Amino acid sequence: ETKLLLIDDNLDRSRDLAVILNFLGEDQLTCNSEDWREVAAGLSNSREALCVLLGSVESKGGAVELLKQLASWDEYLPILLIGEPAPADWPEELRRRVLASLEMPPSYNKLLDSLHRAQVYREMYD
Amino acid sequence: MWRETKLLLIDDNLDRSRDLAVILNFLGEDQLTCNSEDWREVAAGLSNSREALCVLLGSVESKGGAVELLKQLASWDEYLPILLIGEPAPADWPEELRRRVLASLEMPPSYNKLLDSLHRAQVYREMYD
Helix, strand or coil, X not given: CCEEEEECCCHHHHHHHHHHHHHCCCCEEEECCCCHHHHHCCCCCHHHEXXXXXXXXXXXXXXXXXXXXXXXXXXXXXXXXXXXXXXXXCCHHHHCCEEEEECCCCCHHHHHHHHHHHHHHHHHHC | CCCCCEEEEECCCHHHHHHHHHHHHHHCCCEEEECCCCHHHHHHCCCCHHHEEEEEEXXXXXXXXXXXXXXXXHHHCCCCCEEEECCCCCCCCCHHHHXXXXXXXXXXXXXXXXXXXXXXXXXXXXXXX
């Protein structure tokens, strides 16, 4: 019984992403870079979070900093990039957790396939 | 066997209408979006009524009601199927109209029912072409 973790500072895209995820019957919590810890404290524990859906981080230290934090919160939490460049920028270590970099809106298939991939990833890593 | 088509979204509930557009956009389903006061104007931009696969119909605050709206749609093209969004087809309605409503979609829709309803639409279009 898991929830997706939707972390994206572009509010408009977020609202659209949630609409699609609800349509898809995929549960999710909606947070930004500033408040994601609070919202994530709503979950029993961290393993309730299947995957992070990540858009744009407008906080101090950017996506890479948010990501460092995510992996100290749960280093087995895989990431899904949506609507943002694939960055060769990121250190390999935290590029590792990024299952796929998807377009906005993602294709129906890519999205489902990638969520399936996040299922398996969590599972193999428990 | 085919031709290119578009969905026609008529819904005065604007937040629902925007949400529906996001979903259809996600689905790759070309569509035109309107409310009841401007639907004629928006629809005119089609080549003809036959490029409309079907109507997704929401709430109608038009002078009169959705019943009248259905009536105009029918005169326009009587083979143009209707999908009720967010509304069970009222048992109150007259069969000539009811005969055209193929499905009622709960909000937010199910992927499999939306697809099933679009399929019924296509079977219906091409039956009377």
